[PDB]
Write a protein that binds this ligand. Structure first.
Ligand SMILES: Nc1ncnc2c1ncn2[C@@H]1O[C@H](COP(=O)(O)OP(=O)(O)O)[C@@H](O)[C@H]1O
Ligand SMILES: Nc1ncnc2c1ncn2[C@@H]1O[C@H](COP(=O)(O)OP(=O)(O)O)[C@@H](O)[C@H]1O
Ligand SMILES: Nc1ncnc2c1ncn2[C@@H]1O[C@H](COP(=O)(O)OP(=O)(O)O)[C@@H](O)[C@H]1O
Ligand SMILES: [Mg+2]
Ligand SMILES: [Mg+2]
Ligand SMILES: [Mg+2]
Lengths: 373, 667, 373, 373
C-alpha cells in the first residue's frame, strides 16, 4: 500500500522531518549534540553523556554544543547517527524498517559524504529504499514553476543552481561558503565593539537569536552609515536570559551586509548579488529572458527584511536597462526545501526512481553517483 | 482407559501431547492427572456428585498410589508423611480467581476433618464458619473476575495423632495500594459497598455515609452499579456469621466507625496555598476533618497538625516542617492504608484467638495463593504479583528438579552431575539490593526531584543489556520483563504515588491517646512489635521473605488449579486457553527441565516387516545405539544410557525420516 | 543485611549523630573537650583528666573549654579522637566495627585534614567502610531540589556552592571564614560598652546563649540605629546563672550585622549578601534564571529572625529588576546537613560508592582525593 | 625642535613610561590605587585619601588595593586619571603640555574606552598630540621583523595578531580573557589545599610574587604529576614577610597549566597552544610557510621557564610533520611593547600620523576610529 515515504531535511542548522503529502514539516529542532562538561556531584543525576536535539537547548548552561555539520560536509558521524536515530525514534515514532526515506544534500559536496550517508542509512537503520536529491531543485518545486535561478543559502552553503524548463546547467552552478554561521560569528565579533562579550558556545545561541529577531538588511549601506552616527532611531534593545538589557545600534544592518560585501570577514569572492549575475551570464543567450524574471530564492538567511529589495536593486544595476528583474520571495522560504521534498516524494511517477535495497546490495555505496544524480 | 493419566508414564513430553491428553481425559471427568508428586486440576464450571466418604477411608494409606488421581490422595499422603517423619509440612494451592481454589481448600479441609472419628467436635466447623469474613475482606472487582482474592491466605492447623488441635490463620500479602487507588472499571473491597448497603438509616445519618458517589476512594473505577448484586444480603449474612463468633456489638460499632473514618479520609482536599515563600497546603473545609476526628474520638487539631505538617524532633528541640500538596496527599493515603491493614491484622488475630490454640504438635499448612496475573495494563500491583509468583515458581522448580533427580537416580547413578537453571536471575533482577528494580524504586522514592520518567532512565541504564530485560523499541513510558511465562510489559504510571508509606511517629502517638480501647491497644501493639519498612515494596518483600523462611523447612507439596474457559462455560475446552493456563501456572517448566527413556526394542520391532532389520536382538544394550552412531555419526551426547532407557532422542528426530524415505522409495 | 550506616556530622560547634533512614539526629551536643584547672583536695574526686561532650557543659566552672575544631580545620587530633569515641560508644552505644560511617566536611579545607580523618577512622575504630561528603550538597538534598545556590554557615565557615541539575561548579565556590564564633567574639567585645565583662572561657557559653536567645537581624540598619537612641522598646533583659540581670539595648542587632558588614571585625571581604551575588555571576548566563529563584540557605547562624528578609532585599537591590528573587528558609536548617546525609546514606544506589577497607588498604589515605570527590 | 614624544604603556598590571629613542622604560611600577581603611588616631597622620603607584605597595597593610584596569577595559576613570597624573608629574617630572604622548591599547577593546581615553588626555592634560597603537604591532617591531604571529599575554588579555609583510589580518585576530590575573587567582585558590589562606587584597601581592619567583611550566604534565607524588625534589620553599616559611609542592607547575588547559578555572576555550594553531589556519595558504617559522611571543606571562618548549612541542604536534616550527623568545618580552613604541615614536615618517589638537577639536573623540586605526 501507500508507504508514506519520509522526508528528513538534514540542513547545516535546523533539521526538518515529516511525511510526504503534508504541507508542513512535523519536526523542527536544531541539530546539536551536547555533552556535559562539569563535575556531577548528586548521585543519580549523571549517566547522560549525550543530549541530542531540542532537549540540549534548555540545558546548554552545563553542556558543550557541537554542530556535527559544518559548511554542509558531515565532519562527525558517530553523533550524526545519534541525531538521525533521535529524529526517527524519539521524534517521529516511526520505524524506518518499512518506510522509504528521502534526503536533502548540497550540490557540490564531496562524494564520500553521500556514500557514507547511504551506507549508514542502509546498514544501521535498514531502510527499504532511499534517495538523495538537491535542495535547489526541491526549492524550485516549492515555488510552483519549472524555470528560474534558485539561490538557496542555509547555514553552511550559498549555492546558485539555474534551471530552465526542467533541464539543469551543471556548468553554471556556483557554490559559496558564506552562510548564516559566518554571519553569527561576525555579529559575535562586532558586538564586542560596544562592550558585549560572548565567549562560550552557550552564548552563540544568544547571538543567533539576536540576529534572528533584530537584524535587517539596509537598502543603501552608506546612507544608513551616515544616518546612524547622527540619530538614535535605529537603536533597539534585547534582553539576555539573566535580566540585563543590551542596546544594539548600527550593528543590526552591518551584520547581514557581509552577504553583499564578503570582504568584511576576509573573503575575496563578491557578494551574492554579483554571484547571481555571473551565474546567469554563464548560461546561453536566449535563456536570460526567463532567468532575469524568475529569480527564486530560499533558505533561512533570506528573510532578513529588505533583502528582496536590495538584491533586486543590485541586479537591476548590473543587468541591462531594457530587461525586467523580478524577485520571488515566498513567506515560507526556510521550509521550501521540505515542501519540495514532500511534493516530489508524493509523486507516483517518482516511485520508480527509488534506490531499493537489492540494487545497493548488488552494487554498493557507489550506486549513488549513478542513480541519485 | 486408552489414555494416560501420569505425565511420567508418557515417554515423549510435548505441549501438544499434554493438551491432547488433557482433552482426551476431560470427557471421562479425569480432572486430576498425576505429573508425579505434583497434581493439577480443572474447573468443570458445575457441581459434581461429591467424592463420597468412602474415598476418604478405603483409599487412604498406600492405596492412593494405585488409585486414580483424586483430591483426597494428597491429603492422605501428607498425613502418611506426618506419621512417618514426625515433622511439619505444607500444602500449597495455586490458580486464578474463579478456578474453585477456595472451594478446593474447603473440600480438602472437610476431608481432613472427616478422616477421623473426632467429627463430633464443633471446633472443626468453627474454623470454616469464620471463613466468609476473610474473602469478604479480600475480594474486589477485577477485569478478569468480579470475585477475585487479592490477598495471601495462610492456615496452620495442628493435628496430633489425627486429633485436630487449634488452627492458626495468617495473612502475608495484601494489596495495600488498592485501598486508595483502583484501576479503570474496577472496584474497591466489597465491604466498603456493603457498609453503604446494609447500614441502618439512623447509623447512616449519624455517620453521614451516603456520599459513596462522592467518596474519592470508591469512585476511582467509575463503576458502583455492581454493588447492588445482593450485597445487602451478603452484609446481613456476614454480620450473622461474625455474631456467631461472639463479637460484641460495641466492637462492631467501633469497626463501623473506623471504616467510616477511612472512607471519609478520601474527602480531605488539599490545595496550593502560599503560606510563607511557597504554596504549601490548605483545606477547603474542616467539617470532614472534624468528622474523621470524632469517628475515632481524637483531637482534630492533632490530626490536622499531623496531616499538614511534618514534625522532626530530638532531645532538645521539636520543629514542624510544612508539607507540600503531593506529600500531604501521600501521607493522607498512607494513614488510611496502614489503618485498613492493621484492622485486618487485628481481626484475623481475633479470629485466631477465638479458637483455642494448642501446643506444638504435628500440623499441615495450607496456602491459598493466587496464581499469575496478566492484565492489559500491568501496574505496580501486577509487578508484585509477578514477583511473588516468580518465588513460588522457583520453589516449584526446585521441587520438580529434586523429583526428576530422584527419578534419574532410580534409573541410573551417573545422572548426579546433571543440573539446570534454577530461575535465579529472574528473582535477582528485582530482589538484589544494589540494582534491583524494587530497590531502585525504593531509593528513588526519597530522592528530591523524582518523577515516573526518571525511574525509566535509571532502570534502563542500570539493567541495559540484561537478557531478561526488554527495553521498548519506541520511547514509551514502560518496560518489559521476560518471566517464565513469557515477556510481560509494565506501564510505569503513579509508581511513586503508590510506593510510599512513611508513617511518622507523631501519627502513631496521636491515636494511642484516643478514648476507644480497640484502636489504642492495636496501635500500641503495632508500636511494640516494630526495621526497614519505609515503603510498600519493602513491606511486600519482607512478607514474602517471612513466608519463604516459614516454608523452606517443610518440603511441601503443591496442587494446581486451572480455568478451562475464560467465563462460565461448563465442559468447553479450547487450545488457546489451555496454553495460557499452562504458561501462567508454570507447568511447562517440568518439560523444560526434562529436556526421554524410550526403549529401542519397540522401535526396532515396529519396523520388522518394512525395514526388515533383524528383530532378533539377543541382548538389547549398547550395541544398537553404537550401530546407529556408526551409521549416522551420533554425538557422544547420546550416552550415559541406563539399562534399556534414558534416550533423549534428539538425533532421532532427523533420523526417523532419513530411515523412512529409503524404504518408501522402493515402491 | 541492612547495616544501617551511621551519619556523624562533625561540625565546628555542635555534633549531630544518628542512623540512616531516620528524619532526626539521635545525638546533639557541643564538641568541647574540657580539662580541670584547679587543685583537687578531696580524695577520690580526681582521676578525671578529660570531660568530653555535654557532661563538660555543666561542670564548666572548674574546667577550661577547648574547641578541637576552629574555622573547620581540625587543629587537635588527640581530643578529636576522644570526641569521636564518646559520640560512638558513650552516646550511640553501637560498635563501629560492623557499621559504615558517613562524614561531613567543608568544601575548601586542606587535604591533610581529610587524609588524617580517614586514617583515624580506619585504623583506630576499624570501620568497615567510610565516605566523606560536602555539607552543601547534603543540605541541598535536605531541601528537596536539585538546583540552587547553597549558603551554609555553621560555626567555622560560610561557603557558597552553586549546583545546577546535579552538576557542581567548582570555579564558583567561595568560602568565607566569618561564622558564629566571630559573632560570639564580637558580641563579647561589644557587651563591655555597657559594663559587662566576660573574660574566661566559661562565660563564652553565656555569651553564645545570649546570642542564641535574644539576637536578631535588623531590616534597615540605620533606621534602627536612629530608633534605638530615641526609645527603649528594643531593650530586653537576660539573667546570668548567678542571679544578676543584665539589659541589652542596640547590641541585639549590631552583633549579626557583621555578617553583612564584615568591616566591623577588621575583615575586608564584603558580606554574604554580596558574596552570593558575586558567586552567582561567576556561573554561565542561562543558569541565573534558576539560581536567583532557588537561593537555599542552611546552617545554624541563619535562624536569626529577619535574615531571610534582609538577604532577599539586598539581593533584589543587587539583581536586575526584571528578575525574581526567592529565599528558601526551612525551619530545620541546622539539621539539614544531617537530614541530607541520612537521605544519601539510605539510597541503595550509593552503596557502590563506599570506600571499603580493601581499597584503603591497597591504596592508602590518598584514595579520598579520588573516590570521595 | 625634537619634542621627544613620550611612550606610556598602560597595561593591566605594571605601567611602563619613558622617552622615545631610549631602549629601556624610565618608570616601572604597578598601577594600583589604594585607599586607607582603618581609623586614624594620631593627629597629622591622615589627610591622605589615595596612595598611587609604588608608594602604595609598601603601606598595603592598611590600604585596600584596587586595580583600575581589569581584562584590559578601563572600568574606573577617576583613579586612572590619578595614575596618569602620577606617572607624568610625580614620576617623569615632565609637563605633557609640550610633549606628544603615544598610548598602548588592546586589539578588541570597546570603542568607548579609546574615546574616553582620548577625551581625558586632550582635555585635562592638554597634550598637543596623541596617538593610539596596538600592542602586538609594537611587540613585532621590538622583535626586528615584519612577518609573524604575535602572541601577547599581559595581565588582562591574551591576543593573537598575525601580521604578514606589514599587512594585518583582522579576520584572524582571536582574543582570550585568560591572563596573569586568573593565574594568580587560581594559585590563591589552590594554595588552600596545603593549608595556606590568603583572603585580603594585601596577600594577593604575596601570591603574585610567589608565582613570579617559583612557578614554572612543565614539559609533560602527566609525567610530572606522576613524579611529584613519588618524590620531594620538586618541592621549594618561600618566606612570607612575617617570618613563617611555606613549602610548595606540585603547585608550581599546576598554576601555569591553566594557560594550556583552561578547563581548570571553568573556561571552555582551549589553551593558547591550540588558539595559535586555529588563528594560523584562519589565514591564507601561502602564508603559513612564514607564520609557522615566526611565532613571536611577548607579554609578562610568557617568561615561565619551559613555556617556549611546551608551546613548540604542542604546535609541532598540531602542525603537519613536513613543516618547521620556530619559537622566538627574546629575554626582554615584558618590555617589548615599550621598545616597539619607542622605535615607532622615534621614526620621522610617523610624525605625519599624529593626531594634533586641531583635528580633535574640529572632529571630536570619534577621530580615533579613523586616524589611529
Ligand atoms: N528572521 C531571520 N533573520 C535572519 N536570519 C534567519 C532568520 N530566521 C532564520 N535565520 C537563519 O537561518 C538559518 C537556518 O537555516 P536552515 O533552515 O537550517 O537552512 P538549511 O536547512 O539549508 O541548513 C539560521 O542559522 C538562522 O541564522
Ligand atoms: N537561634 C539562633 N540565633 C542565632 N544563632 C544561632 C541560633 N541557633 C544556633 N545559632 C548558632 O549556630 C551555631 C551552631 O552551628 P552548627 O549547627 O554547629 O553548624 P555546623 O554543624 O556546620 O558546625 C552556634 O554557634 C550558634 O551560635
Ligand atoms: N617570571 C615570571 N613568571 C611568571 N609570570 C610573570 C613573571 N614576571 C611577570 N609575570 C607576570 O606578568 C604580569 C605583568 O604583565 P605586564 O607587563 O603588566 O603586561 P601588560 O603590560 O600587557 O599589562 C604580572 O601580572 C605577572 O603575573
Ligand atoms: Mg538549504
Ligand atoms: Mg555546616
Ligand atoms: Mg600586552
Amino acid at each position: 500500500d501507500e508507504t508514506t515515504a519520509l522526508v528528513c531535511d538534514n540542513g547545516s542548522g535546523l533539521v526538518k522531518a515529516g511525511f510526504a503529502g503534508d504541507d508542513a514539516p512535523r519536526a523542527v529542532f536544531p541539530s546539536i549534540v551536547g555533552r556535559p562538561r562539569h563535575q556531577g556531584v548528586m548521585v543519580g543525576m549523571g549517566q547522560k553523556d549525550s543530549y541530542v536535539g531540542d532537549e540540549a537547548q534548555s540545558k546548554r548552561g552545563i553542556l558543550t554544543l557541537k554542530y556535527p555539520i559544518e559548511h554542509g560536509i558531515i565532519t562527525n558521524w558517530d553523533d550524526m547517527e545519534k541525531i538521525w536515530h533521535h529524529t526517527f525514534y524519539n521524534e517521529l515514532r516511526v520505524a524506518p524498517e518499512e518506510h522509504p526515506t528521502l534526503l536533502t544534500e548540497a550540490p557540490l559536496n564531496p562524494k564520500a559524504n553521500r556514500e557514507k550517508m547511504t551506507q549508514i542509512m542502509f546498514e544501521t537503520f535498514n531502510v527499504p529504499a532511499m534517495y538523495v536529491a538537491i535542495q535547489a531543485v526541491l526549492s524550485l518545486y516549492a515555488s510552483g514553476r519549472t524555470t528560474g535561478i534558485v539561490l538557496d543559502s542555509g547555514d553552511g552553503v550559498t549555492h546558485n543552481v539555474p534551471i530552465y524548463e526542467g533541464y539543469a546547467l551543471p556548468h553554471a552552478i556556483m557554490r559559496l561558503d558564506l552562510a548564516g554561521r559566518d554571519l553569527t560569528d561576525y555579529l559575535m565579533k562586532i558586538l564586542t565593539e560596544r562592550g558585549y562579550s560572548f565567549v562560550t558556545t552557550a552564548e552563540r545561541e544568544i547571538v543567533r537569536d539576536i540576529k534572528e529577531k533584530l537584524c535587517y538588511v539596509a537598502l543603501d549601506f552608506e546612507n544608513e552609515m551616515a544616518t546612524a552616527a547622527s540619530s538614535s532611531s535605529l537603536e533597539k534593545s534585547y534582553e539576555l536570559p539573566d535580566g540585563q538589557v543590551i542596546t544594539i545600534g548600527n550593528e543590526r544592518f552591518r551584520c547581514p551586509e557581509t552577504l553583499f560585501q564578503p570582504s568584511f570577514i576576509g573573503m575575496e569572492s563578491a557578494g551574492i548579488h554579483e554571484t547571481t549575475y555571473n551565474s546567469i551570464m554563464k548560461c546561453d543567450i536566449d535563456i536570460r529572458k526567463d532567468l532575469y524574471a524568475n529569480n527564486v530564492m530560499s533558505g533561512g538567511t533570506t528573510m532578513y527584511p529588505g533583502i528582496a529589495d536590495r538584491m533586486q536593486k543590485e541586479i537591476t544595476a548590473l543587468a541591462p536597462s531594457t530587461m525586467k528583474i523580478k524577485i520571488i520571495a515566498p513567506p515560507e522560504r526556510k521550509y521550501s526545501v521540505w515542501i519540495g521534498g514532500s511534493i516530489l516524494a508524493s509523486l507516483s511517477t517518482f516511485q520508480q526512481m527509488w534506490i531499493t535495497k537489492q540494487e545497493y546490495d548488488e552494487a554498493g555505496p557507489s550506486i549513488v553517483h549513478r542513480k541519485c544524480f | 482407559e486408552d489414555g494416560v493419566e501420569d505425565m511420567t508414564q508418557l515417554e515423549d513430553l510435548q505441549e501438544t501431547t499434554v493438551l491432547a491428553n488433557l482433552k482426551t481425559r476431560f470427557e471421562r471427568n479425569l480432572i486430576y492427572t498425576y505429573i508425579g508428586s505434583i497434581l493439577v486440576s480443572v474447573n468443570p464450571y458445575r457441581m459434581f456428585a461429591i467424592y463420597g466418604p468412602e474415598q476418604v477411608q478405603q483409599y487412604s494409606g498406600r492405596a492412593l498410589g494405585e488409585n486414580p488421581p483424586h483430591l483426597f490422595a494428597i491429603a492422605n499422603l501428607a498425613f502418611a508423611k506426618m506419621l512417618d517423619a514426625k515433622q511439619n509440612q505444607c500444602v500449597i494451592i495455586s490458580g486464578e480467581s474463579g478456578s474453585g481454589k477456595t472451594e478446593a481448600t474447603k473440600l480438602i479441609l472437610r476431608c481432613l476433618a472427616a478422616m477421623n472419628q473426632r467429627r463430633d467436635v464443633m471446633q472443626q466447623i468453627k474454623i470454616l464458619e469464620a471463613t466468609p469474613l476473610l474473602e469478604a475482606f479480600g475480594n474486589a472487582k477485577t477485569v478478569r473476575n468480579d470475585n477475585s482474592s487479592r490477598f495471601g491466605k495462610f492456615v496452620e492447623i495442628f493435628l496430633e495423632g489425627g486429633v485436630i488441635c487449634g488452627a492458626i490463620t495468617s495473612q502475608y500479602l495484601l494489596e495495600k495500594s488498592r485501598i486508595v487507588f483502583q484501576a479503570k472499571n474496577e472496584r474497591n473491597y466489597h465491604i466498603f459497598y456493603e457498609l453503604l448497603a446494609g447500614l441502618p438509616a439512623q447509623l447512616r445519618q449519624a455517620f453521614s455515609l451516603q456520599e459513596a458517589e462522592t467518596y474519592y476512594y470508591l469512585n476511582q473505577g467509575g463503576n458502583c452499579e455492581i454493588a447492588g448484586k445482593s450485597d445487602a444480603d451478603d452484609f446481613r449474612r456476614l454480620l450473622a456469621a461474625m455474631e456467631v463468633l461472639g463479637f460484641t456489638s460495641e466492637d462492631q460499632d467501633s469497626i463501623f466507625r473506623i471504616l467510616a473514618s477511612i472512607l471519609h479520609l478520601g474527602n480531605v482536599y488539599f490545595e496550593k496555598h502560599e503560606t510563607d515563600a511557597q504554596e504549601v497546603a490548605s483545606v477547603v473545609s474542616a467539617r470532614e476533618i472534624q468528622a474523621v476526628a470524632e469517628l475515632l474520638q481524637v483531637s482534630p487539631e492533632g490530626l490536622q497538625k499531623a496531616i499538614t505538617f511534618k514534625v522532626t524532633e530530638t532531645i532538645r528541640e521539636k520543629i514542624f516542617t510544612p508539607l507540600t500538596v503531593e506529600s500531604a496527599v501521600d501521607a493522607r493515603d498512607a494513614i488510611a492504608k496502614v489503618l485498613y491493614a492493621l484492622l485486618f491484622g487485628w481481626l484475623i488475630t481475633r479470629v485466631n484467638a477465638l479458637v483455642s490454640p494448642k501446643q506444638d504438635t504435628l500440623s499441615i499448612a495450607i496456602l491459598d495463593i493466587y496464581g499469575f496475573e496478566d492484565l492489559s495494563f500491568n501496574s505496580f500491583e501486577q509487578l508484585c504479583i509477578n514477583y511473588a509468583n516468580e518465588n513460588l515458581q522457583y520453589l516449584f522448580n526446585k521441587i520438580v528438579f529434586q523429583e526428576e533427580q530422584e527419578e534419574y537416580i532410580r534409573e541410573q547413578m551417573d545422572w548426579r552431575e546433571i543440573a539446570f537453571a534454577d530461575n535465579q536471575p529472574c528473582i535477582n533482577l528485582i530482589s538484589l539490593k544494589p540494582y534491583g528494580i524494587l530497590r531502585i524504586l525504593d531509593g528513588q522514592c526519597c530522592f528530591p526531584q523524582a518523577t515516573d520518567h526518571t525511574f525509566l532512565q535509571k532502570c534502563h541504564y542500570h539493567h541495559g543489556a540484561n537478557p531478561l530485560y526488554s527495553k521498548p523499541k519506541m520511547p514509551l513510558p514502560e518496560f518489559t520483563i521476560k518471566h517464565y511465562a513469557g515477556k510481560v510489559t509494565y506501564q510505569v504510571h503513579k509508581f511513586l504515588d503508590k510506593n510510599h508509606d512513611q508513617v511518622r511517629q507523631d501519627v502513631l502517638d496521636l491515636f494511642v491517646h484516643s478514648r476507644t480501647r480497640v484502636v489504642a491497644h492495636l496501635f500500641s501493639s503495632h508500636a511494640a512489635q516494630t526495621y526497614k519498612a519505609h515503603t510498600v515494596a519493602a513491606k511486600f518483600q519482607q512478607s514474602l521473605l517471612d513466608l519463604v523462611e516459614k516454608m523452606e523447612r517443610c518440603n511441601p507439596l503443591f496442587v494446581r488449579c486451572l480455568k478451562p474457559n475464560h467465563k462460565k462455560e461448563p465442559g468447553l475446552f479450547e487450545p488457546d486457553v489451555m496454553m495460557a493456563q499452562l504458561r501462567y501456572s508454570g507447568v511447562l517448566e517440568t518439560v523444560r527441565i526434562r529436556k526421554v527413556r524410550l526403549p529401542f526394542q519397540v522401535f526396532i520391532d515396529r519396523y520388522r516387516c518394512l525395514v526388515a532389520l533383524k528383530l532378533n536382538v539377543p541382548a538389547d544394550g549398547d550395541m544398537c545405539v553404537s550401530l546407529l552412531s556408526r551409521l549416522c555419526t551420533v554425538t557422544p551426547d547420546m550416552y550415559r544410557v541406563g539399562i534399556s532407557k534414558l534416550f533423549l532422542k534428539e538425533h532421532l528426530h532427523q533420523l526417523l525420516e532419513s530411515m523412512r524415505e529409503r524404504v518408501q522409495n522402493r515402491a
